[PDB]
């Protein structure tokens, strides 16, 4: 049923705005939108500079349980660990609940597996010390090949990713059911489904597509696995489509 999958998907959304024209007022509006008439999203995802006003806004409307996710090393996934760590420490100091860091995928495409491992591990150590979850964006659209998607997923998991996420939403190709299945198969094959969640992101716009992404999760790990600690939708306009499927 689409309605059951849509409500489920809504409660798993990282409701996102990551735009050149973002403003405090736009993030405040996103916070109000996260408190939907059928329930709250799992989180918002915003640039780090909007975290403090977002936290205040979420608290004052009585939804402090809507988590605050942000992005670092974003969107480029450069291989400078000092910079990626510095942005991650800034995100923490701002008040992030979760940091979505971009894996250095161009370095991996060049044959360097080590910098990706160290970059994820450095950011994880900072986040873990602050009780902040770390998601790792591997950019499946640029990786393109299934072997590289598996490898970037494997490196991120071994380096301590709490989530692996398909995409930044800033490149030509983002989440696809094919890329989602590959990444979830890595979680399954590595036996880390209890400690590593999955997050399709970018281009996920319809309730029909959200249903397909959850179906893959249900198929691989059972219908009870995809909770907020283990599954998120990185999306924006998807919320309107999920609500329309629900009667709002
Ligand atoms: Mg470099
Ligand atoms: Mg070393």
């Amino acid at each position: 049923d689409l309605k059951a999958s849509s409500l489920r998907a809504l409660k798993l959304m990282d409701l996102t705005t990551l735009k050149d024209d973002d403003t405090d007022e736009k993030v405040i509006a996103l916070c109000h939108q996260a408190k939907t008439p059928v329930g709250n999203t799992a989180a918002i995802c915003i640039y780090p500079r909007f975290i403090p006003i977002a936290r205040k806004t979420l608290k004052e409307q009585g939804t402090p349980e809507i988590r605050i996710a942000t992005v670092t090393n974003f969107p480029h996934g450069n291989d400078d660990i000092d910079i990626a760590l510095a942005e991650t420490r800034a995100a923490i100091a701002y008040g992030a609940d979760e940091v979505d860091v971009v894996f250095p995928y161009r370095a991996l495409m060049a044959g360097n597996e080590q910098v990706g491992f160290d970059l994820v591990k450095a950011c994880k150590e900072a986040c873990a010390a602050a009780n902040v979850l770390l998601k790792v964006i591997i950019e499946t659209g640029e990786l393109k090949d299934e072997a590289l998607i598996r490898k970037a997923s494997e490196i991120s998991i071994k380096a301590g990713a709490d989530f692996i996420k398909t995409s930044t939403g800033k490149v030509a190709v983002n989440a696809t059911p094919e890329s989602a299945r590959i990444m979830m198969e890595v979680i399954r094959d590595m036996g880390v489904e209890k400690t590593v969640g999955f997050k399709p992101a970018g281009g996920v716009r319809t309730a029909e597509d959200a249903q397909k992404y959850l179906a893959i999760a249900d198929e691989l790990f059972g219908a009870d696995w995809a909770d907020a600690r283990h599954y998120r939708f990185g999306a924006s306009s998807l919320l309107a489509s999920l609500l329309k499927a629900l009667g709002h």
Side-chain angles (χ1 to χ4, degrees):
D1 161 82
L2 198 57
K3 284 181 191 181
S5 72
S6 296
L7 180 62
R8 194 179 177 208
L10 184 153
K11 296 188 168 172
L12 297 169
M13 285 193 58
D14 283 7
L15 181 60
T16 301
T17 186
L18 294 168
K19 297 165 192 187
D20 292 347
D21 69 333
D22 283 343
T23 62
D24 294 340
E25 316 95 68
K26 282 163 181 310
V27 171
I28 287 158
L30 193 85
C31 291
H32 299 331
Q33 180 179 17
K35 180 184 174 176
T36 89
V38 294
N40 299 334
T41 66
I44 59 168
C45 185
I46 54 179
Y47 283 120
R49 73 193 175 270
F50 300 119
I51 293 171
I53 184 57
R55 181 74 82 192
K56 174 169 189 170
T57 306
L58 295 168
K59 177 183 175 186
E60 289 188 355
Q61 71 182 17
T63 67
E65 74 275 15
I66 292 173
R67 311 147 177 87
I68 304 179
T70 194
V71 294
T72 58
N73 205 36
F74 183 97
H76 42 76
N78 288 344
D79 77 337
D80 189 320
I81 296 169
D82 295 318
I83 288 179
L85 184 56
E87 304 184 342
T88 298
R89 297 191 324 256
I92 293 165
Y94 271 129
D97 292 317
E98 309 181 352
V99 172
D100 290 21
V101 67
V102 184
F103 187 91
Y105 60 87
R106 276 179 324 261
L108 176 63
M109 293 170 73
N112 185 343
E113 307 185 1
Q114 189 65 39
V115 62
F117 180 91
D118 292 356
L119 194 152
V120 168
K121 176 161 169 284
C123 294
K124 171 62 184 289
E125 286 177 345
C127 289
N131 294 100
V132 170
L133 298 181
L134 182 74
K135 317 198 195 87
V136 180
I137 310 167
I138 66 166
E139 204 71 294
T140 52
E142 297 296 297
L143 292 178
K144 183 174 165 54
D145 299 325
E146 166 167 11
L148 287 164
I149 294 175
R150 297 196 182 270
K151 179 57 64 173
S153 293
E154 290 170 0
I155 293 165
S156 301
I157 282 162
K158 291 176 171 186
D162 299 310
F163 278 81
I164 54 175
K165 174 177 163 168
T166 63
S167 316
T168 59
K170 301 293 188 181
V171 293
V173 172
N174 296 279
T176 66
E178 180 178 89
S179 292
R181 182 173 289 275
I182 293 165
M183 294 177 65
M184 288 193 251
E185 285 180 1
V186 174
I187 296 177
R188 177 202 61 190
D189 295 343
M190 293 188 70
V192 295
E193 72 277 357
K194 291 181 291 289
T195 50
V196 179
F198 175 69
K199 177 176 176 183
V204 184
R205 311 204 211 279
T206 68
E208 291 76 11
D209 277 320
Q211 179 182 52
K212 294 193 300 205
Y213 285 109
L214 283 174
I216 300 163
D218 290 355
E219 175 197 325
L220 301 200
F221 305 109
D224 295 299
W225 178 79
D227 59 22
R229 174 55 181 86
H230 296 87
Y231 208 95
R232 305 288 180 79
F233 283 103
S236 49
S237 64
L238 174 69
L239 176 60
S241 174
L242 300 175
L243 289 166
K244 199 193 185 189
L246 290 180
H248 290 80

